[PDB]
Design a protein around this nucleic acid. Structure first.
Ligand SMILES: [Mg+2]
Lengths: 49, 207, 113, 113, 57, 300
DNA sequence: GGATTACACCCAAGACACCAGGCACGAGACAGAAA
RNA sequence: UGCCUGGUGUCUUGGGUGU
DNA sequence: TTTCTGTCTCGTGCCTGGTAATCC
């Protein structure tokens, strides 16, 4: 993840108008899928996909 | 064959904590990790995840009247001595009193009977190593002054011998780096060494 | 003082070469400095710095000045030095280079001043 | 020089393959990374070498041998110099000329300058 | 930890002792905490010194 | 005796500190404590200490043999002859002492080694002497159906793995519990797995690497006590399914052995660990045999 | 024929192996066939 | 006791800024 | 029509190679 803050994003991954933003803040939240690793061994669904 | 062997409290403790009952019992000192500080108790964690607690009577010295939070904080690990062990529940109580954390040195139960143990040899080696500890190192002092000269008492007197009456030389003193010996010619073949005590010294070589 | 308060520091470097970042340290007050360590302190007053303008036609285009920390966002020059730099204040920009050693600081203060 | 520069060493019989540090790959997007130009040129050279070896052992029409060996010579030559006057340059699939090793070292943006 | 040397196949070894900094903690004679990689000198004996590699008990 | 290396290296925490200054230790008592003599020999081989064997009445034997050997003459010539005989006898004693000391040392070494060998043999026999767990209402020696549940460490992100094996010794089904073990969902899913699928394990084994497994064991025991998960008995005070801890040296070694990987190429390491635990419960002897060479590295 | 033609800095915008065709695994549906 | 993240394409092209 | 099923089409998958001065 980026070192900025994701707390200003809404549920849909987009910031809302009227919100003050600073440098390095995340204004668009996007993720790309990755083939899962062998973490399904003992991770309680908390594995990076 | 005998029936299946069921682990008991000691076996379960050894299996889980990987610590033997002998190596973790009363009268042992371990470097536990402070996890939570409270006014009436402190909650600490050992190396082997064994959660421990100390009642307020032992975090601070009985003479001191300070607060536990001021002296000790989270993340500040300290030495502790085991008082009680709850093997079934993996709970232990500790003491921070120096009568345990410091005085407990010869924790081994080796029989020191003079018939079979050479107490005299161990004692002699003990003063040998203690004298070795007392041994230190010392070096010379360097001072920048027109009338300062790194000479002995006799050396200073001989240096002033070739000079007329009243000339002054300055040399390091034998009483310490905080002292200075000043030698001046009182009379032909007569010299006075005066010790000067230094105060508020910036450095050993400094004035 | 930390990396946000002037005068401050950014890093503490141990003898072995490890860098301690003061932004991400929760126990900055619990750091004791030993002799021989390095502290990457902030730029302060009277620090020699090399100052330069392009194109560097001659050797007077790089000269070492003494730092004075000031508000607002522009470098400030005495107007007598605008001739060797061939600079005026209609939008020109100039480069500043910080020496990183005692030897280099001495060279700047004794040769390029 | 007998020890250092022997005349027959001017003909290449074994080619040194530089490490990936010399020809690093670049991630064009979040998923697909791009092979470097030198990597593609080395792949072409190795394919030509395999082709020559396969052709030699199976059956030897001299015309085919001449064509394939001339292709190998062209690939090896353009891997180190892609500005040979008098013949067309090696081109990428995008149509741009291949950045040979010689082009890496010359110009304002080359290695030396 | 005893000071002896052993030779064993990789299979025979149990596992690596992964310890967090909250577990790998060292305290010197004076009680000052010493962390991984710090340089300490033996108080007695050969009085050697070196950098800490791992802390256990 | 202590060399300079012994004078400096024998620390209060070192195991050699037990005999740093021992003196006049009886030989006859050494055989009852072989490890002390073995450790003394080991320290000697390290160039730290020197073991010396001496007799309190050596002078008595020397004088007796001299009296046997000495002449009874009183003349100065006889005095010179007796002096020569005594000096030669002392030289002979000087030559003879080291060989006898070495022979006695070797004898005691062999005795202590044999004693410790027998002790290790008995310890290993005690370790490997245990019949498989006997389920109630069954004769001894019956192989029980077993279910193993484990999560390893218990850090945030540690799911609980379950592996069930029948009496045949073949894996029947493996399940993952991806919810928190303290949630109602975990208990409900475990109860559904236990009851609905007709698994009916005779005993449930729980093991781990740290104390976090204790909470899982307590939670499982509470669940068993709450849902009255009695064992199915083939055709009436039905007995509850037992939940115990399991020793896991063989399981730990099996989770790293390539034999498991060949046997189970598409299974996690924790699944292999649970399978090893289940096989150990079914038959400890065969699991101890499966160690092959790594059995010698067990703490016996 | 070959080689080279000032220095530094800023920003924005458009492209970067695609593909097609022959070879494999699994599956399933609608029609065969006895009763 | 629930406990904190540093890792950023490349190649072309265009338009600009100070001399 | 009920029931067991065949077997050949076909969805899903994939391998892997074709395709402007000047100057010396
Ligand atoms: Mg201007």
């Amino acid at each position: 993840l980026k070192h900025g803050t994701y707390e200003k994003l809404d549920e849909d991954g987009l910031i809302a108008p009227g919100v003050r933003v600073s440098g390095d803040d995340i204004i668009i939240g996007k993720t790309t899928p990755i083939p899962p690793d062998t973490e399904e061994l003992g991770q309680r669904t908390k594995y990076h996909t | 064959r005998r029936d299946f062997h069921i682990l008991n409290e000691a076996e379960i403790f050894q299996l889980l904590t990987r610590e033997t009952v002998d190596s973790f019992r009363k009268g042992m000192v371990i470097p536990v990790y402070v996890r939570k500080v409270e006014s009436s108790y402190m909650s600490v964690s050992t190396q082997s995840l064994i959660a421990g607690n100390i009642q307020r009577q032992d975090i601070l010295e009985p003479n001191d009247r300070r607060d536990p939070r001021e002296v000790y904080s989270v993340g500040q690990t300290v030495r502790a001595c085991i008082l009680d062990v709850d093997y079934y529940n993996f709970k232990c109580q500790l003491s921070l009193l120096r009568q345990f954390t410091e005085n407990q040195v010869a924790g081994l139960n080796v029989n020191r009977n003079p018939k079979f143990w050479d107490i005299e040899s161990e004692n002699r080696d003990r003063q040998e190593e203690i004298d070795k500890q007392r041994e230190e190192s010392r070096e010379s002092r360097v001072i920048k002054h027109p009338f300062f000269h790194n000479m002995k008492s006799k050396e200073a007197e001989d240096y002033l011998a070739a000079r007329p009456v009243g000339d002054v030389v300055i040399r390091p003193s034998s009483k310490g780096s905080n002292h200075i010996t000043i030698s001046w010619k009182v009379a032909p073949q007569l010299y006075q060494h005066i010790d000067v005590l230094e105060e508020n010294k910036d450095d050993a070589n400094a004035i | 003082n930390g990396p946000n308060e002037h005068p401050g520091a950014k890093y503490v470097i141990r003898d072995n070469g490890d860098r301690i970042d003061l932004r991400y340290h929760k126990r900055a007050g619990d750091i004791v400095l030993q002799y021989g360590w390095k502290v990457e302190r902030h730029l302060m007053d009277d620090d020699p710095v090399l100052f330069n303008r392009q194109p560097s036609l001659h050797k007077m285009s790089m000269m070492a000045h003494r730092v004075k920390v000031m508000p607002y966002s522009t470098f400030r020059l005495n107007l007598s030095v605008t001739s060797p730099y061939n600079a005026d204040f209609d939008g020109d920009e100039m480069n500043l280079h910080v020496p990183q050693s005692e030897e280099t600081r001495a060279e700047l203060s004794q040769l390029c001043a | 020089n007998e020890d250092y520069a022997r005349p027959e060493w001017m003909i290449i019989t074994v080619l040194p393959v530089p490490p990936p540090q010399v020809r690093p790959s670049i991630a064009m997007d979040e998923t697909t990374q791009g092979q470097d130009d030198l990597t593609h040129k080395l792949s072409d050279i190795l394919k030509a070498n395999i082709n020559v070896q396969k052709l030699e052992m199976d059956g030897s029409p001299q015309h085919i041998i001449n064509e394939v060996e001339q292709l190998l010579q062209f690939h090896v030559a353009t891997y180190m110099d892609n500005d040979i006057a008098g013949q067309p340059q090696a081109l990428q699939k995008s149509g741009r000329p291949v950045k040979a090793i010689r082009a890496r070292l010359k110009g304002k943006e080359g290695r030396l300058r | 930890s005893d000071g002896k040397l052993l030779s064993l196949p990789p299979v025979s070894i149990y596992s690596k002792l992964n310890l967090n900094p909250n577990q790998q903690i060292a305290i010197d004679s004076n009680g000052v905490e010493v962390k991984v990689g710090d340089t300490v000198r033996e108080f007695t004996g050969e009085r050697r010194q070196g950098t800490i590699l791992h802390v256990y008990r | 005796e202590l060399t300079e290396r012994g004078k400096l290296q024998i620390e209060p925490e070192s195991p050699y500190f037990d005999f740093k200054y021992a003196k006049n230790r009886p030989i006859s008592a050494l055989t009852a404590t072989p490890d002390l003599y073995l450790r003394m020999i080991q320290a000697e081989n390290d160039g730290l200490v020197n073991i010396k064997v001496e007799l309190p009445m050596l002078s008595t034997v020397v004088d007796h043999f001299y009296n046997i050997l000495k002449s009874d003459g009183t003349s100065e010539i006889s005095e010179k002859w007796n002096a020569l005989r005594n000096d030669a006898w002392k030289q002979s004693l000087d030559k003879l002492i080291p060989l006898v000391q070495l022979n006695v040392k070797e004898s005691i070494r062999r005795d202590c080694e044999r004693v410790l060998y027998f002790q290790v043999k008995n310890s290993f026999t005690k370790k490997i002497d245990q019949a498989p767990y006997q389920p109630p209402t069954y004769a001894k020696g019956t192989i029980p159906r077993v279910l193993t549940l484990s999560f390893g460490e218990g850090n945030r992100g540690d799911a609980v793995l379950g592996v069930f094996m029948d009496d045949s010794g073949d894996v029947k089904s493996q399940i993952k519990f991806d919810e928190d073990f303290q949630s109602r969902d975990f208990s409900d899913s475990l109860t559904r797995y236990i009851k609905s699928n007709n698994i009916n394990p005779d005993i449930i084994g729980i093991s781990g690497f740290n104390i976090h497994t204790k909470k899982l064991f307590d939670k499982v025991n509470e669940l068993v006590n709450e849902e009255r998960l009695t064992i199915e008995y083939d055709n009436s005070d039905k007995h509850l399914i037992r939940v115990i801890y399991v020793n896991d040296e063989t399981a730990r070694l099996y989770q790293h052995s390539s034999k498991s990987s060949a046997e189970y190429p598409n299974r996690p390491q924790l699944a292999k660990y649970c399978i090893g635990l289940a096989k150990y419960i079914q038959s400890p002897l065969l699991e101890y045999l499966a160690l092959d060479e790594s059995m010698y590295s067990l703490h016996i």
